A paper describes a structure:
Each segment is packaged in a ribonucleoprotein complex (RNP) together with the nucleoprotein (NP) and the three subunits (PA, PB1 and [name]) of the trimeric RNA-dependent RNA polymerase, which mediates viral transcription and replication in the host cell nucleus. The [name] residue at position 627, which in nearly all human and avian influenza strains is either a lysine or glutamate respectively, is the best characterised polymerase determinant of host range and virulence. Here we extend the structure-based exploration of host determinant residues through the identification by random construct screening of a new [name] domain (residues 538–693) that contains position 627 and is thus denoted the 627-domain. The 156 amino acid 627-domain is located between the cap-binding and NLS-domains and contains six of the seventeen host species determining sites described within the [name] subunit: N567D/E, I588A/V, T613V/A, K627E, T661A, T674A/S where for each position the consensus human and then avian residues are given.
We have also determined the structure of the complete C-terminal region of [name] (residues 538–759) which contains both the 627-domain and the NLS-domain. The 1.95 Å resolution structure of the double 627-NLS-domain (residues 539–753) shows that the two domains pack side by side forming a single module. The well-structured part of each domain shows only minor differences from that observed in either the isolated 627-domain (RMSD of 0.5 Å for all Cα atoms of residues 540–675) or the NLS-domain in complex with importin α5 (RMSD of 0.78 Å for all Cα atoms of residues 694–738). Only the inter-domain linker (residues 678–692) and the visible part of the bipartite NLS (residues 736–741), both presumably flexible, show different conformations. The inter-domain linker comprises two parts: residues 678–685 form a poorly ordered, flexible region while residues 686–692 form a well-ordered interface between the two domains. This interface comprises 11 hydrogen bonds including one salt bridge (Glu687 to Arg650) as well as burying hydrophobic residues on helix α5 of the 627-domain and on the NLS-domain. The complete C-terminal region, comprising both the 627-domain and NLS-domain, also includes the host variable residue R702K and, in the inter-domain linker, the HxN2 subtype host determinants S682G and S684A. The atomic structures reveal that all seven of the host-determining residues are located on the surface of the double domain. A superposition of the double 627-NLS-domain structure, assuming it to be rigid, on that of the NLS-domain complexed with importin α5 via the common NLS-domain shows that there would be a significant clash of the 627-domain with the C-terminal region of importin α.
Numbering used by the authors: 538 to 677, 686 to 741
Amino acid sequence: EINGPESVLVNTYQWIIRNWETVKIQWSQNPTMLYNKMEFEPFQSLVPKAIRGQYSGFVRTLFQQMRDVLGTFDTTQIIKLLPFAAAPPKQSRMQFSSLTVNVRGSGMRILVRGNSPVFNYNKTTKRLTILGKDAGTLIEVESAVLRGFLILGKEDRRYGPALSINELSNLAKGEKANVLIGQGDVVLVMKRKRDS
């Protein structure tokens, strides 16, 4: 269905679920090829031109963190963020809690952690809904939310008051803090000793 921006989004994610068995493998083994797939061009046209590259740099880094940190594979996070990795990457130190696509003049937020009006995944039914439309069902520590950090788990009061995602510049490597990550949530994070 190519009736406007909403159709482009729904179809992009439908294509990923449809092709997930091959897409998974390529994501693991040959990501440049996956990111360069011409099927991500439509989605990319909806991503604000001024920030596409940074978004991609950001998402490419998260994906590498996931590849490097054993046991942190997260299918829905990979599916959600994948189209944003299709831009030529530009680096920054910026942390994004949401990634915007432009739908008829409106800037729609795809939240990096969790569900949003654009990307809603039902963990029980395994159904992915995209702006109201079914994109299909998925057949069966957070390493791909913040750039340079792992989310270790729920808030640990011992590490004190929660920082905003913006105040994490001040952490040393190996250091941990609570972070207001989005929604009602505070989570314990650790700045990584490795770069990805």
